[PDB]
Amino acid sequence: AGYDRHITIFSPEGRLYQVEYAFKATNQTNINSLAVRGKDCTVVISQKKVPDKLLDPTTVSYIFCISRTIGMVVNGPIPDARNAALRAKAEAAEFRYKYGYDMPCDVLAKRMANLSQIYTQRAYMRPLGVILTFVSVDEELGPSIYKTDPAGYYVGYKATATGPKQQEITTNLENHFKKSKIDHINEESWEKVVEFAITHMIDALGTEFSKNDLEVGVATKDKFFTLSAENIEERLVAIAEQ
């Protein structure tokens, strides 16, 4: 039939082209992120762009607070970003209620993952075109980053980046942990991990940043906070004085 990729049906090549089309639509906000594991923290930095002077700059955001321990960073269209932010919130209430402790990030990776499969198995549900980066600090697994993607595939990371220019970032992170020879930076405080992160991003993307063009989210132990433009301004001066 001429219908063969309107629905989530295999091709002669044995493939789901429909699902592939989601991954070509995870790059429309053209924002880039990089997220690195310290020793006792996790740090995730993303670009901010406003297209006009006439928006309010605060509300423009891509780093969405899910649990009070699990941050979530979104690459791809903001309509499907929100639908992804909501579902996740729903499961976080749901886990505490029935199991009597806060949701582990690890478990949020599989639930939201299995849910993604269910959208590519119904022949009437269009998958979310958002790559989610989940950052956390767990006590049972330590600092972790889990990346889910529109297929429902996922794996763990030692560091990871996402975005259309994200190849460039992959060079910086690969070279960096090649020299350290370990999966995590030996640094005992979140401050200097924000300082490191911004440095590889300046190298990779080739442009230096400002306070109003950054957006930073930090997972510490037992709380998840986002830093404001003022706290980000402090960090930038201290890269220069290293």
Partner: protein
């Protein structure tokens, strides 16, 4: 075919349906939202089709709760469904939590409803743009909602045919007043740029409707500007364009 619906995907990141919904909103009349220090001020250009009409007897600004103004452009009947839905959702929240709904909460809700209409074969994504705001106790906020389910904070937003004239003039107003302006002083500003937005629409004649929700004039309720205050605005603008 892959250019016909919403559940389809195409390898350009386009989902042609939804983009076509903006083209509906582009047939609408100009609607602006002026974000002031004390609240929000909406005005809508209302076309007078014929001299057979009964004047000032159609409201294109409909209230949701008692504190969230809502004005929409695109398909007029289609918009009336979206507002009815946000009056249900406001009423559900008012019961369950015994307070008038916050505006970032009202945002979540509506946002979800239109997003929904891009994930099923049997539905069409609504082709309307809304502009909604008011005063809640975390302060005044304003949101514009795209038919794609995209939205942002805004110190001034617009949509409609004469979104071309209106936008340039809103830049002018944040560079006039970059420390903001009063909600009283802004009645005269909404008159001025609705009148200028009828030089892309001068094949007819029109009636100006202005409404406000500001803390300092209306005690945080969504009211209409009426009587002698309303004609001072009409005169002001009328003399500048002559």
């Amino acid at each position: 075919g892959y250019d016909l619906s919403n559940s389809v995907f195409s390898p350009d990141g386009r989902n042609f349906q939804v983009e076509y919904a903006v083209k509906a909103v582009e047939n609408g009349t100009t609607s602006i939202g002026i974000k002031c220090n004390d609240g929000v001020v909406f005005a809508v250009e209302k076309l007078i089709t014929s001299k057979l009409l009964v004047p000032q007897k159609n409201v294109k600004i409909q209230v949701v709760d008692r504190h969230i103004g809502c004005v929409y452009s695109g398909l007029i009947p289609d918009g009336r469904h979206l507002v009815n839905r946000g009056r249900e959702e406001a009423a559900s929240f008012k019961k369950l939590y015994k307070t008038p709904i916050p505006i970032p909460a009202f945002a979540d809700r509506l946002g979800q409803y239109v997003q929904a209409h891009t994930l099923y074969n049997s539905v069409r994504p609504f082709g309307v743009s809304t502009i909604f705001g008011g005063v809640d106790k975390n302060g005044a906020h304003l949101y514009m909602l795209e038919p794609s389910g995209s939205y942002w904070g805004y110190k001034g937003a617009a949509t409609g045919k004469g979104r071309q004239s209106a936008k340039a003039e809103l830049e002018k107003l944040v560079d006039h007043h970059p420390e903001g302006l009063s909600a009283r002083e802004a009645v005269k500003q909404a008159a001025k740029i609705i009148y200028l937005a009828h030089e892309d629409n001068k094949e007819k004649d029109f009636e100006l409707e202005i409404s406000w929700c500001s803390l300092s004039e209306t005690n945080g309720l969504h009211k209409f500007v009426k009587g002698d205050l309303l004609q001072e605005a009409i005169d002001f603008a009328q003399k500048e364009i002559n």
